[PDB]
């Protein structure tokens, strides 16, 4: 494993502590053996998410301090509009308070627009993989979300350059089967979050967009981790070997008509989202009308002026290749520490998180007793580190049968915030997990002390078994 | 007119400038004679809104700096939960990104709650007066909004203590006409923003709640300006003459079951909202499931940790009687400057804005040519002050005729941000408006160069007539 | 009296409170009836000084946040060097931690320089008026401080354009008497702080420098309030009616060889000082050598990087004419409030303070019983305002007879920080002092409970007589 | 070599960059081959000093934002007085703008105090080792600075627990030789900066204090790195291995009568200093009278209120053992990386810096050609790292002969700021120096292009010989 040095130094710190073992046991028992219920005060290194937990720069904080809080026509709104033109060549923006807000702005408008043409009678969206909130918004508006990620993504430990790719054969089949009139939009998610932060190649984006344009289908680039995707394109595609990151980004966005973005990810923010539309003014106008009742006025969209200011600066910083090399290299470093110690992971690592296959660590725990959660709980008890389950516990029950949905993989996700933790923190995570290797066989499954009907992973309370 | 000194001093300043007349000419023509389309760089004193434009304290900025950005279990979530229990005696909170986010969280849940017993076949909401966004969500969710404000409010220039009161007779008559089973909720807006930021008396709040509990009707307190309402209760109700402001607030919330709040008003913030529920855990649970797709995870709700931290502090500062006395007294001072010059206003002035009756200023301009907007535009051209229209331009067209819906009053709202402008800024505003008395007769109406089919006040491009 | 509106609005506030009547009485008693011993918690409006209590802009705070803390070669040191070249045309800078630090750097070097070829056996400094620290450093280095302000300054209530001018007659007479080989330097204090912040004319500065240059005398511009002096030159000198403030400043510094500056005044800082030398590289070199042991290394001089950053921005903001017009107008406003009410003041008001002649308010209190302190104490008891004494209590005892040195006048100084207080704060001060007109007769003098042998005004404890 | 993980995470970053090799060559040329003349923009990792370059916490920045800028009686002054009483049990404080400001306040007062006692006719100060500014102030006041560090300090590569100790026999000898009536003060420097940041044992501090008290000699603790010293006492003295760091600190200050402190070191600040006096009120009063003309009024001492606020917080944070173990462990890790690669260092490493013996690295370069500076310059040219010379260049010329003072050791100091650089930055430094092992013999000495008469290391320009 190779450590890559920070292309920055620390300007402000935030104290974190490891509770004593007895405190960690007490806290975890108190949280019903569900770390989502732990107070942050009980957590040392927090790996639940890379969303909104990033460290900003001094320039971002300085931009916040001079932010224009005007209700209409904030100076930072116009800066953000200019930045979107400069990065993406897109002519229209609507800020949002975060990414799911940007989806709530754009997606119902896209459906309405296609319906007003007499189409979208049986409406669907097609994506390489819809993210959780993306699919939920699609389904809230009476549309089917179809996911057609490449079969490369399902071979967890076998390397491939582009595990986030669309399956082009499936794309064409689905267009032919549903009809182009019924495809409200194609959503290109970069990197592909549900494939584990795996990149989509430039040629895949290009071919998807060419097909869509031939059919008149609108394409949305879901852009939370677009810089990480651009880095992978430059690293792995020989055509972009000598291109700058902004050149890669510029080309990527030739292959969408609009973007939705959680700015809480690659733009290095704690809050914020963005809609940008390449040049369809009609859709922009419709989206502005939905922005008003749902988010705010069209020149702040539920964002303080200071956060638009931080976004302008963070959009810039998030494209910096030296930072991206270090950020993605830190994720790869953690994965390599685990992989070299025999811990099975999704490989190669994506831009923002390492996925550990817990089914192989604790074979004795069946899926319906949540083996990845057992590993996560053990990890927390051992170290104060809080990870998140991507397995049976998260997948929930099948609403028709009331029984556990069979999970393809039982993943523990180690989600890495940007510019927050050092490689010594990475070693701490890796060493604590490696150090459980004699304990894995003894670990016990989990049962429900209390279960919600929906979204159970957030608030359910568990109890160990036997 | 009486100037009340600030119970604080200035710690940080933000430069503002008066654009030249020709800059103001070109900007208003560029904005299509709609000041909502003006960039803030074209605006001297901005009176569009008191929402999110407030000046924070050093303690609020300090709280932001130490804010906990944890995705789950943020230290500031628990502080906020503790704060709502202290001020309102409510046991459950859900943060939101702002006020209309709070409404979008709670109101659909209230409809589902009443409906799940066979009720709400013809569902309605009853308020003293729904603000714009509140009534837009009510109607977005298939319900009708009913504004049963006291008719005292419609006698613009005649003093009354409680021009925001419910009309109790209209409340009882609406409950009989529609039936208790169709009334999803009663919404008590404090202060009553649409009535001119006019207070609701404690005895009115009590009688509404008692009437509502007779029929099993849930009561929500729209609480964006609750502190200004508490001040007016202490100022005008003999029972609370010796009460602290917090004691007044505590009593107010005995007469609701939950609250929605834009924290961008009285809690002195630039962003932020809040749902609090007194004790109905079931409605809290349903509300948390809607918060997730629309806003964020339930322990930050579309808000950075730093904004929850600022909200905890701002909630405290917003209750401070010396501050409220000064703030409301500034609004009163501006009103008195105009009223003493023969400029007709809503009297008494409310908590956050002065409302000028422009029907009496430009009689030669009829409603369908937007008299209050002609006055606003003249004020902007004369001085660089940007105000906002509460008249025929806002009201829009009727869904039946496609013609101009008749407006009761043609108001110009001079909305005052908290702790931002001095009484010398007030004098600038008053003197610019007073100096238009020689030019009112010359002004002309406004016609549409561009009119969007909905929300026209935000983006329509008007044009001077003749 | 004319209120002048702020050319800015408030972005951050700082809470200040008026202690109750009983609280102020108890605090003043614990403070031994000396406001210099009051904790700030006991003070509402603080008028002790305009030094280091200014409100900064958002741009200044932003500059602090990105400040470069490098020990050597800070980006902000080069920015400050460039700024000094731009504003003053001076080629060399040495940052200092504040104004008296700048004097400690330069004045001993100037004396050693004058005592390096031949002899300055009776060394003296000559100023229109040495400020307290300036004269203290002069006397600490074995030199006499000679103050030769124009006699117009001593006609307290009669208007004059340039009450800060050098007496040209007394200058030529001092040079003839002491010889140009004993005059270590001439100090041009702009504005003349000890005269009451009164300006020095461009013609006066120029003639002083020409006289100094023909005698080979070095000229230092004491530049704490150099922008306020520039404002007064533009306002009152017809030659500069259409010059910019920066053009006025640029001309001022043609008439000195170096400057010492408290950046805690006109550059709008809370900490900071500066030495700048026009072109004498030898003086620069030796001054750098004293800087190292007394202040710090020469590229930060006892200042954090963020404070050099704030100083670069504040140097710019302090020259802005709209701000200077409001600032000096607010001081003039406080003085016109008192003058129109019969309270005697120095007229016209200087740039930064109002001076009240207290010997006329309490004639029954002789100089040796500190009548101006009795007015200050009464003012504090009535209002919580803290002012400072400039009279017999400050003047101290004559070290020979050990008795009260006769003070020519007894002043109370109402010193006004920059961008901190509103004109309503000014009214509050003025109305409190005016309201004491009926109590001025019954006021008692003060006597010593504890008196230090030196600097007694800072730590002495006083007791009301009778 | 053992990497110790951070007991904090990153909340704000500051971009740094490695200039190209072409840029580093051009910059070093422009700086006359003196890294002290490089702009910070030419520097990647800056190792010039650990003074004032530390990263603060979010709690420290929050304290700055609410800091009280009052001229007299600042809230943060009383907090600072309380904090000194808590940590040191000292009753009196005088804030200073930094450590040499604190020395300028206290040392002249101590001399006058001993002289007024009819003594101090041939005055001296005795220290384990006076720091540069300390010895400068001692000599500026006509006294001799006598350094009597343990001979264990001069066996550079051989471990010893307490290389900062006083030589007790030399202390007793010097007291007799000069006479107690001539010893103005004994200065206990903790850690002993000039011995390399090496600790002084508790028993040494105690014995030195008891000896001083037997002779009536005042003892000052020079306290810039008192927490690092307390850590070493806890780490190495079995008496204290169960004490808290604050218990160790509390015991240390039983063995002094006053302290001077650069708060730019262990209290984790970018600016600030402190005098504290244990109980001698007379010395406190005299030091206050010197504070006023030299630093500022006695309740801010040339510090903004925000910096007294940051100091209160940093004094607490600087005592935290988890932090100290990481900080000192990171310095140790850098030293172990070098030592394990055969690079000769002072061993054990001190609290704040690694010292590399460059005499062993470039034996072909004589001392008066500055071998350590050649290694430093080569390190910069290869890496962008800027280190500082502690050898013949710094040592300067002998006043009596004008020749190069012979240097016992030719050290390169790698000075490590607190909480700024990660262990990956340490690896970068070590790997760059280790990659020079094949270039050391080819390195050539330096000669003067420009040499100032004093303090030449700051400003002299050098040139490679041939
Ligand atoms: C003329 C339109 S400007 C909109 C800002 C604003 N009022 C917002 C209010 C909201 C929504 O809250 P937010 O989403 O945070 O805006 C809820 N309830 C009440 C009583 C309000 O007044 C104003 O200026 O009156
Ligand atoms: C409570 C009264 S004392 C506060 C000092 C302040 N004046 C400071 C000053 C200095 C010292 O500069 P600095 O060391 O930064 O204070 C030098 N030259 C001039 C012309 C000055 O006016 C003032 O009068 O209010
Ligand atoms: C069940 C994981 S919750 C984490 C949600 C976050 N917005 C994300 O992008 O992953
Ligand atoms: C060898 C230069 S010493 C310069 C002194 C400074 N306080 C420091 O810590 O470096
Ligand atoms: Na966040
Ligand atoms: Na805002
Ligand atoms: Na610094
Ligand atoms: Na200050």
Give the SSE layout.
The complex is a heterotetramer, with 2 copies of chain A (about 475 residues) and 2 copies of chain B (about 475 residues).
Chain A: E1 8-15, H1 21-30, E2 56-57, H2 58-65, H3 75-88, E3 92-96, H4 99-116, E4 124-127, H5 132-140, E5 144-147, H6 168-178, E6 183-189, H7 202-215, E7 218-222, H8 226-236, H9 245-252, E8 258-262, E9 273-277, H10 281-294, H11 305-318, H12 321-340, E10 353-357, H13 358-361, H14 371-383, E11 388-390, H15 392-395, E12 411-415, H16 423-434, E13 446-450, H17 456-459, E14 461-464
Parallel strand pairs in A: 4-5, 4-6, 6-7, 7-8
Antiparallel strand pairs in A: 3-9, 8-9, 10-12, 11-12, 13-14
Chain B: E1 8-15, H1 21-30, E2 56-57, H2 58-65, H3 75-88, E3 92-96, H4 99-115, E4 124-127, H5 132-140, E5 144-147, H6 168-178, E6 183-189, H7 202-215, E7 219-222, H8 226-236, H9 245-252, E8 258-262, E9 273-277, H10 281-294, H11 305-318, H12 321-339, E10 353-357, H13 371-383, E11 388-390, H14 392-395, E12 411-415, H15 423-434, E13 446-450, H16 456-459, E14 461-464
Parallel strand pairs in B: 4-5, 4-6, 6-7, 7-8
Antiparallel strand pairs in B: 3-9, 8-9, 10-12, 11-12, 13-14
The structure holds ligand YAR, the ligand CCSCC[C@H](/N=C/c1c(COP(=O)(O)O)cnc(C)c1O)C(=O)O, 2-amino-4-ethyl sulfanyl butyric acid (2 copies) and sodium ion (NA) (4 copies).
PDB class: lyase
Keywords: pyridoxal-5'-phosphate, aminotransferase fold, cation activation, inhibitor complex
Assembly: tetrameric
Specify the biggest β-sheet of chain B.
7 strands, mixed
CATH top level of the largest domain in chain B?
Alpha Beta
Structural class of chain B: alpha/beta
Task: Give the bound compounds.
Answer: ligand YAR, the ligand CCSCC[C@H](/N=C/c1c(COP(=O)(O)O)cnc(C)c1O)C(=O)O, 2-amino-4-ethyl sulfanyl butyric acid, sodium ion
Instruction: Please write the CATH class name of the largest domain in chain A.
Output: Alpha Beta
PDB class: lyase
Keywords: pyridoxal-5'-phosphate, aminotransferase fold, inhibitor complex, lyase
Assembly: tetrameric
Entry title: Proteus vulgaris tryptophan indole-lyase complexed with L-ethionine and Na+
């Amino acid at each position: 494993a190779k450590r890559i040095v920070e292309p920055f130094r620390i300007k402000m710190v935030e104290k974190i502590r490891v509770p004593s073992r007895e405190e960690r046991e007490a806290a975890l028992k108190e949280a019903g053996y569900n770390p989502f219920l732990l107070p942050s005060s009980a957590v040392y290194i927090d790996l639940l998410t890379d969303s909104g937990t990033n460290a900003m720069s001094d320039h971002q904080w300085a931009a916040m301090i001079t932010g224009d809080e005007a209700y209409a026509g904030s100076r930072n709104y116009y800066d953000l509009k200019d930045k979107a033109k400069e990065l993406f060549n897109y002519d229209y923006i609507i800020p949002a308070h975060q990414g799911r807000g940007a989806e709530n702005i754009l997606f119902p408008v896209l459906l309405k627009y296609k319906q007003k043409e007499g189409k979208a009678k049986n409406p669907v969206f097609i994506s390489n993989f819809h993210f959780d909130t993306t699919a939920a918004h699609v389904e809230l508006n009476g549309c089917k979300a179809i996911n057609i990620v490449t079969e490369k993504a399902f071979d967890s430990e076998t390397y491939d350059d582009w595990k986030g790719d669309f399956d082009i054969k499936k794309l064409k089949e689905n267009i032919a089967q549903h009809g182009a009139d019924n495809i409200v939009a194609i959503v290109s998610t970069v990197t592909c979050n549900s494939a584990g932060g795996q990149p989509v190649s430039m040629s895949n984006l290009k071919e998807v967009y060419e097909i869509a344009k031939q059919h008149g289908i609108f394409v949305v680039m879901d852009s939370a981790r677009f810089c990480e995707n651009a880095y992978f394109i430059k690293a792995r595609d020989p055509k972009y070997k000598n291109a700058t990151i902004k050149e890669v980004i510029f080309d990527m966005y030739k292959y969408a008509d609009a973007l939705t973005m959680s700015a809480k990810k690659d733009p290095l923010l704690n809050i914020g989202g963005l809609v940008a539309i390449r040049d369809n003014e009609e859709i922009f106008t419709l989206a502005r009308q939905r922005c008003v009742p749902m988010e705010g006025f069209v020149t702040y969209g539920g964002l303080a002026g200071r956060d638009m200011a931080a976004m302008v600066q963070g959009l810039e910083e998030g494209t910096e290749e030296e930072y991206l090399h270090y950020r993605i290299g830190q994720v790869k470093y953690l994965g390599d520490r685990l992989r070299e110690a025999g811990i099975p992971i999704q490989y190669p690592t994506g831009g923002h998180a390492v996925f550990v296959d817990c089914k192989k660590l604790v074979p004795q725990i069946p899926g319906d007793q949540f083996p990845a959660q057992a590993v996560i709980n053990a990890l927390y008890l051992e170290s104060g580190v809080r990870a998140v389950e991507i397995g049976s516990f998260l997948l929930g029950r099948d609403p028709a049968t009331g029984e556990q949905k069979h999970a393809d993989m039982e993943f523990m996700r180690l989600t890495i915030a940007r510019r927050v933790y050092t490689n010594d923190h990475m070693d701490y995570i890796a060493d604590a997990l490696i150090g459980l290797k004699e304990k894995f066989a003894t670990l016990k499954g989990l049962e429900f002390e209390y279960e919600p009907p929906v979204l159970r992973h957030f608030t359910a309370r568990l109890k160990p078994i036997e």
